[PDB]
């Protein structure tokens, strides 16, 4: 595996039609950890629930 590689996965906000609560998450864009509205389902690993977790990995 390779946990650092998750840092270049594309931002994926998830499926709007799910019944999950939406939530702030963070993703790495190559120069910064950027906040986005995660739809609470789907997505990929470039998805952090704290800016600190994004910064400590990417």
Author numbering: 1 to 58
Can you provide the manuscript's text about this entry?
Amblyomin-X is a Kunitz-type FXa inhibitor identified through the transcriptome analysis of the salivary gland from Amblyomma sculptum tick. This protein consists of two domains of equivalent size, triggers apoptosis in different tumor cell lines, and promotes regression of tumor growth, and reduction of metastasis. Amblyomin-X is a Kunitz-like FXa inhibitory protein of 106 amino acids and 7 cysteine residues. As a recombinant protein, Amblyomin-X inhibits Factor Xa (FXa) activity in vitro and presents the anticoagulant property in animal models.
